[PDB]
Structures are given as structure tokens and as C-alpha cells.
Amino acid sequence: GKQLTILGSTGSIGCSTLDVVRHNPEHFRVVALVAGKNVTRMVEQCLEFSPRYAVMDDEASAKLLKTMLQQQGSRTEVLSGQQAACDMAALEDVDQVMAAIVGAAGLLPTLAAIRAGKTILLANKESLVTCGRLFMDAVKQSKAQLLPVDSEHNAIFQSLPQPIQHNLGYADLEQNGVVSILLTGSGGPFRETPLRDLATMTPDQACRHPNWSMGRKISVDSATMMNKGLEYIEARWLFNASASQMEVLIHPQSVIHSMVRYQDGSVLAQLGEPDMRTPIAHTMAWPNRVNSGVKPLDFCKLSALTFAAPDYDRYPCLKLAMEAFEQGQAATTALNAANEITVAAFLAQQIRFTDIAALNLSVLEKMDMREPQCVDDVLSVDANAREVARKEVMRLAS
Amino acid sequence: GKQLTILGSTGSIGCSTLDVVRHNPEHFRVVALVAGKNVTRMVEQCLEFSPRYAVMDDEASAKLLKTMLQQQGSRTEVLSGQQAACDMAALEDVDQVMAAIVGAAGLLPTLAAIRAGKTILLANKESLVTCGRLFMDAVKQSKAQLLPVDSEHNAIFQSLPQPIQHNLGYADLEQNGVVSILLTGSGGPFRETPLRDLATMTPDQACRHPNWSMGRKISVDSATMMNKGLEYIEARWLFNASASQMEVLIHPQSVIHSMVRYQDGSVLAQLGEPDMRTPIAHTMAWPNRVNSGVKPLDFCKLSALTFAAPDYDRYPCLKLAMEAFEQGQAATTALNAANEITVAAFLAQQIRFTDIAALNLSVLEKMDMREPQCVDDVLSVDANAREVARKEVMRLASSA
Ligand SMILES: NC(=O)C1=CN([C@@H]2O[C@H](COP(=O)(O)OP(=O)(O)OC[C@H]3O[C@@H](n4cnc5c(N)ncnc54)[C@H](OP(=O)(O)O)[C@@H]3O)[C@@H](O)[C@H]2O)C=CC1
Ligand SMILES: NC(=O)C1=CN([C@@H]2O[C@H](COP(=O)(O)OP(=O)(O)OC[C@H]3O[C@@H](n4cnc5c(N)ncnc54)[C@H](OP(=O)(O)O)[C@@H]3O)[C@@H](O)[C@H]2O)C=CC1
Ligand SMILES: O=P(O)(O)Cc1ccc(-c2ccccc2)cn1
Ligand SMILES: O=P(O)(O)Cc1ccc(-c2ccccc2)cn1
Numbered sequence A: 001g002k003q004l005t006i007l008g009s010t011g012s013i014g015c016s017t018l019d020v021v022r023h024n025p026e027h028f029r030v031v032a033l034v035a036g037k038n039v040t041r042m043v044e045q046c047l048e049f050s051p052r053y054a055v056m057d058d059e060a061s062a063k064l065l066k067t068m069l070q071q072q073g074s075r076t077e078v079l080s081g082q083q084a085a086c087d088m089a090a091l092e093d094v095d096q097v098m099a100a101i102v103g104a105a106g107l108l109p110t111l112a113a114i115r116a117g118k119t120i121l122l123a124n125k126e127s128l129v130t131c132g133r134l135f136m137d138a139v140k141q142s143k144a145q146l147l148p149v150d151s152e153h154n155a156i157f158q159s160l161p162q163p164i165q166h167n168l169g170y171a172d173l174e175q176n177g178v179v180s181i182l183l184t185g186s187g188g189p190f191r192e193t194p195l196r197d198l199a200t201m202t203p204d205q206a207c208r209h210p211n212w213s214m215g216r217k218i219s220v221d222s223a224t225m226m227n228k229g230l231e232y233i234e235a236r237w238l239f240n241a242s243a244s245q246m247e248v249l250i251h252p253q254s255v256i257h258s259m260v261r262y263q264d265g266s267v268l269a270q271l272g273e274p275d276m277r278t279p280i281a282h283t284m285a286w287p288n289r290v291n292s293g294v295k296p297l298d299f300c301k302l303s304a305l306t307f308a309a310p311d312y313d314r315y316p317c318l319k320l321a322m323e324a325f326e327q328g329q330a331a332t333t334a335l336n337a338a339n340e341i342t343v344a345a346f347l348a349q350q351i352r353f354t355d356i357a358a359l360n361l362s363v364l365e366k367m368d369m370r371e372p373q374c375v376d377d378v379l380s381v382d383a384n385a386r387e388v389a390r391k392e393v394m395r396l397a398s
Numbered sequence B: 001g002k003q004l005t006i007l008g009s010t011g012s013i014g015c016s017t018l019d020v021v022r023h024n025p026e027h028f029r030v031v032a033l034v035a036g037k038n039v040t041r042m043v044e045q046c047l048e049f050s051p052r053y054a055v056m057d058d059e060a061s062a063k064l065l066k067t068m069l070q071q072q073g074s075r076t077e078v079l080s081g082q083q084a085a086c087d088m089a090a091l092e093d094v095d096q097v098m099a100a101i102v103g104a105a106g107l108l109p110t111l112a113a114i115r116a117g118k119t120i121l122l123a124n125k126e127s128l129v130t131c132g133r134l135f136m137d138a139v140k141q142s143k144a145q146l147l148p149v150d151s152e153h154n155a156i157f158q159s160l161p162q163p164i165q166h167n168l169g170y171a172d173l174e175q176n177g178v179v180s181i182l183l184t185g186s187g188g189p190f191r192e193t194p195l196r197d198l199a200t201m202t203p204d205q206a207c208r209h210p211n212w213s214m215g216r217k218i219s220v221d222s223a224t225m226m227n228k229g230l231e232y233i234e235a236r237w238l239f240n241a242s243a244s245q246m247e248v249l250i251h252p253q254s255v256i257h258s259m260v261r262y263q264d265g266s267v268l269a270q271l272g273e274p275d276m277r278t279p280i281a282h283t284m285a286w287p288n289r290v291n292s293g294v295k296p297l298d299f300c301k302l303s304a305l306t307f308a309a310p311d312y313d314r315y316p317c318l319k320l321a322m323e324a325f326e327q328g329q330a331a332t333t334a335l336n337a338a339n340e341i342t343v344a345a346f347l348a349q350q351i352r353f354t355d356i357a358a359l360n361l362s363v364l365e366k367m368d369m370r371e372p373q374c375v376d377d378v379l380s381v382d383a384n385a386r387e388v389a390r391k392e393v394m395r396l397a398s399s400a
Helices: A012-023 A039-049 A059-071 A082-089 A104-115 A126-142 A151-158 A195-200 A216-224 A226-239 A277-285 A316-327 A329-347 A353-367 A375-397 B012-023 B039-049 B059-071 B082-089 B104-115 B126-142 B151-158 B195-200 B216-224 B226-238 B277-285 B316-327 B329-347 B355-366 B375-398
Strands: A002-007 A028-035 A053-056 A077-080 A096-099 A119-122 A145-148 A178-185 A246-250 A256-262 A267-271 B002-007 B028-035 B053-056 B077-080 B096-099 B119-122 B145-148 B178-185 B246-250 B256-262 B267-271
Touching: A002 A012, A002 A082, A002 A104, A012 A028, A012 A039, A012 A096, A012 A277, A028 A039, A028 A082, A039 A053, A039 A059, A053 A059, A053 A082, A059 A077, A077 A082, A082 A104, A096 A104, A104 A119, A104 A126, A104 A375, A119 A277, A126 A226, A126 A329, A126 A375, A145 A151, A145 A226, A145 A277, A151 A178, A151 A226, A151 A256, A151 A267, A151 A277, A178 A226, A195 A353, A216 A226, A216 A316, A216 A329, A216 A353, A226 A246, A226 A316, A226 A329, A316 A329, A316 A353, A329 A353, A329 A375, A353 A375, B002 B012, B002 B082, B002 B104, B012 B028, B012 B039, B012 B096, B012 B277, B028 B039, B028 B082, B039 B053, B039 B059, B053 B059, B053 B082, B059 B077, B077 B082, B082 B104, B096 B104, B096 B277, B104 B119, B104 B126, B104 B375, B119 B126, B119 B277, B126 B226, B126 B329, B126 B375, B145 B151, B145 B226, B145 B277, B151 B178, B151 B226, B151 B256, B151 B267, B151 B277, B178 B226, B216 B226, B216 B316, B216 B329, B216 B355, B226 B246, B226 B316, B226 B329, B316 B329, B316 B355, B329 B355, B329 B375, B355 B375
Parallel strands: A002 A028, A002 A096, A028 A053, A053 A077, A096 A119, A119 A145, A178 A246, B002 B028, B002 B096, B028 B053, B053 B077, B096 B119, B119 B145, B178 B246
Antiparallel strands: A178 A256, A256 A267, A267 B267, B178 B256, B256 B267
């Protein structure tokens, strides 16, 4: 079947990927698993999927893993550190690399897979949010096939014509009859909150998305629409879309995952149950399909589907992201880094809900760095933006 | 430059297709126009599009047209009759044939295109409602490309993978990751009417689709969901779908035109403004795209989108169509034919709204014909079913 390396196997996307393989043991062979510190989950995955290699970024973790796998009678070879992670991404015999490491740490292993011309199941945000120019250049250079895993981008990918799907990132949209890309977002828990009350929203209220339940960081990003802002940045790189070829639409029910508008009037959309196994199984099977374990969407048990235009007075972060894109990878990197700092401060009750957007702006205004030319440059912008952001939080809470 | 024949150029689909040509004069050349009796419309189209040929099915119409064009200095050659219509569909240099003749009259001209291996932009309902097996067998033999123009089928086509699109009729759904085809219908004006009030609904009520504005016959078919039943028949042929691979959903807003359900849980859908130029331009440009004149769908000005399962007590015609399919082309042809007669009788106030389903069933029960083996056989089932249906109407309008 297809030989796969899973980068970030022990996290949420990694576990969902392995559930797809579990459903399709004849179509997929796990060659390598890479993770950080979750030795316990990693052991269980090595014992189920029999990979050739298992890598832990953390050395103490790698040593403990080796001792457990030995105790358990497994001969999976245990490696450690960043170079081994990149090596697994570049293994000559692997076909697909699930790029699911979180944060800047996913950058070099992902680039290693790109440079190796692998099919990349891309689920690491920083890759296009921070390194969109560098990675799209590298993809063109190696002819690597990117298959986006995030629900929105995968929905768009499924709704795009074949010549774009092949050649993803270099194809011309207009030449292929595409007018625009329609990014849909829930609008978050404060979609209908009076604007006066936004300054007093609590972390528990912000993380209380009506319908979904997910991590606190992403819940807050959904409340600010920073999440859609970051997906805007990725979509422009992934789909070769100009600002006029992008539309953002609030869709509270999140049944339509995103859409593509065509020259003749047609709009194609992908819909489905809210379950990451669907987009993951799509990318793993492309251009064919596999069972993912996700149940068929029941159209008779849906809330009525509604749409609205995002109000930038309600979602300044969405506008900030759009503007940042225009300023370049230094601005997008700085925004993403600043946002991690301000959201964490919000969750720690150091700042108010509305201070997230205000301090994100403040960081971008204060900085002005030059366009990154390599991953080290991006890492540098990221580090500097966090420091500026932390000082801003301290001043404010000071 | 794609060379085309337009069968039924003077009708609604015909006019919409020439608007697409008008918007894209450098991508499409009109070689031949074919119609029935609308000499006036035909004259204008010939002056504007300069086809090599124009045919009218009606002989006097063809004669009237021949002179007017010679007068206005048109170089188009005017022919007449069905054989001429079929020859246009088979012209060696023609790339695409827009199959937009209404009724049993569209069968032989559409078939001529299929036998010629043409790309067919299929609009004519009778082609697959009555000759589904014959026509799909024919397209498989000549490797003709079918491109469905009807909104539902076109939406499904656009939501299907490339291996199915390019082998439409022959490809296996399952092997291509497709679990089912989701056909959406508005549910008509009586979607929420008390069942016991259906018997008293008037033609004007049935034809007053709250949200849509179309011909009287189609409006009644929308009210009974016979329209969806006919499309179910077409879809099973066109997409090679078994009964378990078909779903019918009521979607009152008709924004989603139909959908395709995949193995991984994904559902692909096509949405757009309710303008036939969209699906027409889709088929004309496929696998590429062209401007159609249709404005982008404004998602901020929509009614909330809803869905529901059809209740067969409310829509017995839908269920009759599904059952007819299982009995073969003799049954689907008889149902289509009986429904023409019973809808016309309802509209003429000879029978009740609810007598349409009742009499359609009664015709089907009285018919006992073999599977048709060629178009002529289908025409005979049609002729016979019409007469059975007329007598049922008269029995009901006269006696008990
Ligand atoms: N969750 C979702 O619905 C979606 C998430 N995304 C993106 O996908 C990526 C992964 O998300 P998710 O799976 O939710 O995140 P998780 O935090 O659940 O998992 C992250 C994975 O990365 C591993 N990891 C962390 N640091 C390193 C490192 N230095 N080297 C190697 N592995 C490391 C973790 O290992 P361990 O736990 O063992 O320490 C874990 O396996 C993120 O970038 C996220 O933004 C995109 C689309 C959808
Ligand atoms: N209207 C719609 O939105 C849709 C319609 N369809 C189907 O497409 C087909 C065409 O529909 P529509 O355009 O609305 O129908 P119309 O009634 O508007 O047009 C019918 C066309 O066929 C011509 N015609 C009739 N008899 C003959 C004949 N014997 N030989 C040659 N031409 C003939 C008419 O010519 P003339 O007027 O000159 O006499 C006219 O050009 C129908 O089967 C319909 O069910 C499918 C999907 C959508
Ligand atoms: O689209 P966003 O807002 O960035 C994140 C998000 C939030 C909610 C949902 C959602 C999922 C299921 C039901 C209702 C809402 C999906 N994604
Ligand atoms: O799907 P049906 O019911 O057979 C025909 C039909 C009726 C109404 C509509 C419709 C179109 C636009 C707005 C509201 C309803 C579309 N098609």
C-alpha cells in the first residue's frame, strides 16, 4: 500500500491518522512515527502499527521508549532529536508524510519532506503561516504534492478542478475557471454578543464554543476569528489566490466546510460531519477514497444553514491577518507568534478578551522586520515577536 | 472553437444556450439550429448566429423560413423534417449537440448524436426517462460523452470524480469512492399543506410555486414530486446507481442543486443562482469554464437552508417513479406518458390534484407490455399508455 511517515503521531491529528490506517490496514503501512515526549502513547502506537522507526524529539523520552519497547519485545528502532525526525520525513521508500508536528518545531521536518519530493499531508500551521513563500518555492522546486489536512483547506481542495489539485500552489486560478475561494468560519461563541460586552468576556466563556469543544488556544482563536485569519494566510499561499480571489464568510453551523466559486456561476462545496478523519482519509487516499469511520452526514438532523459577512469591528484579528499577509512573511510570523503570547495571557487572566487584538496590533506596529529568506530568519522573527508581545502584556497588566 | 448543433434552439434551453454562445463568440460556432414551428425566433437566431443549416420539423414552417432568410440575405440552408434533424445531430464537423427538443420527438435526434459519438449536452427528459437502457448501451458502444444539462444532474456531475465524469454511464460508483447520489427537490407549493386538503387544490394553486416561476406542467410535477421521480429514473441510468445508492431530499430553498456522498464521509455539492445558463455553460466548456452571464450567488442574501425526507403519503408519484424503475423502461415510459395526460386533465379541471397519482398508478396496473428493445417499441408503449390514461380520465370525469 502506501508507506507513511507520521510526524507528530501522538497528538490529535496523529491519532486520527492512525485511526484511518486502522480502518485500512491493507492500504497503508506505517514506516515511521515521530513525536515529542508522550512515551506512553508512542509505545502503544509502536505495538499496534509495527513501524521500522520511532523517533522522540526529547532524548530522555527516546531512552525511556527504547526500554519499554524492549520490555515489550518490540524491535522497532528508537531514534531521538531533530535530525532523525527530518530523516524519517525523507526516507527513500516512504510515499506520504503526515506533517502534524505543532508549532515552529514542525518546520524543518516538514521542509525535509518537501525537499524529498514526498506527498505531504499538511497539518502544521506554521508551515504556510510563517514559511508560505519559502515552502511554496521549495514545493515547485521538488514537485512535492501538498494535500491540505485542515478542514477548510481540504474542503477547498476537494472543490477545485483537477489541474489545480495537481500543481497545487502554482496553477493559475483564473485560467482554470476559478473566481474565488470561499473560506467559512463559525464566528465563534461571541458572534451575537453586544460589542460593549466583549471587553468583559471570561476565558471560560471564550472557550465555551456553543457547538464543538476543542483546545483552549484554538477556541479563543475561533472567538477572535484569528483562526480564520491564519487560514486566510495559508489559503492564499496554498491556492495561489490574490486578495480579490478570497472571500471569508461566517457560517455558524459549520456544515459547509468551505467552497469554491466558478466563472459560470457554480459554487462547489464540501460538507460533512465535524470529524478530522474525513479530511485526513481524503488526503491519504487521494485521488481515490477510503472508509474513515466517520458516519454519513444526516441532512434531516441539521440546524438551518446560515451565512453572514464578518464584521471587522467584531473581529479585528481577521482584518489584522489579511493586512499582515500584504506586509509579508515577517508580519504573518510576528502576528502568529504575538497571538500565542496574547491568547495565553488572556487565558491566564492577565489581559482582557479585547486586549488580544489590541496587543497583536501593537506588536506588529512596533516591529517592522525584513522579509525572511530562510527558516532561521523566520525563527528569529518568531522569537523577537514573542518578546515584544510578552513586554506588551507585562506593561498592560503592570 | 467548438462547433455545435442546437436541437430545439427556439425553446427555453435553446435560447439560454445561445446566450452562452453570445458571451463566448470565440469559443463556440453554431453550425446548425433545429426547431419545430417557431419561425419568428428561428429567423432571429439565424441572422445573429449564421448557422450553416437550420431545420424546422414542420414543413410549412421550413418553407416560410427558407424565403425570409433568402430575403434578409442569410446564407443558411433551410431543411425540413425529422431525418434532417437527425442528420444535423450527426454532422461530421460538429463537436457538441445540445439536445433540447421536448417530448418523444427528442429521442431520434438525440440518439443520432449518440450513434455519431458526439458530446451530448443532454436536456431532453424522455431520453433517459423512457430509453435509459437503450441510450446508455448506445453511449457505451460509441463512447459518446454525455453532459447533463438539468440542474440536479449537472450538480451531481460536477460533484463526481474525474474517472466517473469521463466514463459517465459505465464507471462503477463504489470503486470510485462514491456511496450515494443525493437528489434535492423543492417539495413544491404543498410541502406543508394538510394531506386532506390536497384533493381540493386548484391548478392555479399548484402552479403558484411560492419561490419559483416555470411552465404549468413542470409546476404541477414539482407539486407532486413527479419531477423528482423522473429525475430519480434519469439519475440511476446516467450515474449507474442502484436503489441503495440514491437518496431524495427535500430542500425548499433550492440553493444546493444536488450532492454526492463519499466513502470517507465527505459530501460534495454544487450551489448557485437558479439560472439555467450555469449548467449549460458548464457542459459547453467542460473540462474548462466559461462566463455564462450568471451573477455570483450572494450568500448574505439567502434564506436559511433546510432539508427533510420526502413523505410518500404526501408524494405518491415519487414512490411510483422509484417502483416503475424496477419494472423497466416499459413502466417508466408508461408513467411518463400517463402523467402527461393526467397533469393536462388536472390543469383542464377534469380531475382533482390527487387524481394525478391515482390515475398514474391505475394506468401502470393496466399496462402489460414487454421491455422495449428499440426506440420504436418505446414510442408504442408511450402511444398506448396515453390512450389508457385518456380513458381513465374520461371514466373518472364522466362516470364513477
Ligand atoms: N487538531 C485539529 O483539528 C487541527 C490542527 N491543525 C494543526 O496541526 C498541527 C497538529 O495539531 P494537533 O494534532 O491538534 O496538535 P497536538 O498538540 O495534539 O499534537 C502535536 C504533536 O506534535 C508533537 N511534537 C511537539 N513538539 C515536537 C517536536 N519538537 N518534534 C517532534 N514532535 C513534536 C507532539 O508530541 P507529544 O504529544 O508526544 O509531545 C504531538 O504528537 C498543529 O500545527 C495544528 O495547528 C490543523 C488542522 C486541524
Ligand atoms: N426548461 C428547463 O429549465 C429544463 C428543461 N429540461 C428538458 O429539456 C427539454 C427542452 O426543454 P425546454 O427548452 O424548456 O422546452 P421548450 O418547450 O421551451 O422548447 C422545445 C424545443 O423543441 C422544439 N421542438 C418541438 N418539437 C420538435 C420537433 N418535432 N423537432 C424539432 N424540434 C422540436 C421547439 O421548437 P419550436 O418552439 O420552434 O416549435 C423548441 O425549440 C425538455 O425535455 C425538458 O424537460 C431539462 C432541464 C431543465
Ligand atoms: O471555523 P472556526 O470558527 O475557525 C473553528 C470551528 C468552530 C466551530 C465549529 C463547529 C463544529 C461543529 C458544529 C458547530 C461549530 C467548527 N470549527
Ligand atoms: O426541484 P423541483 O421542485 O422539481 C423544481 C424547482 C422548484 C422550485 C425551485 C426553486 C428555485 C429557486 C428558489 C426557490 C425554489 C427550483 N426548482
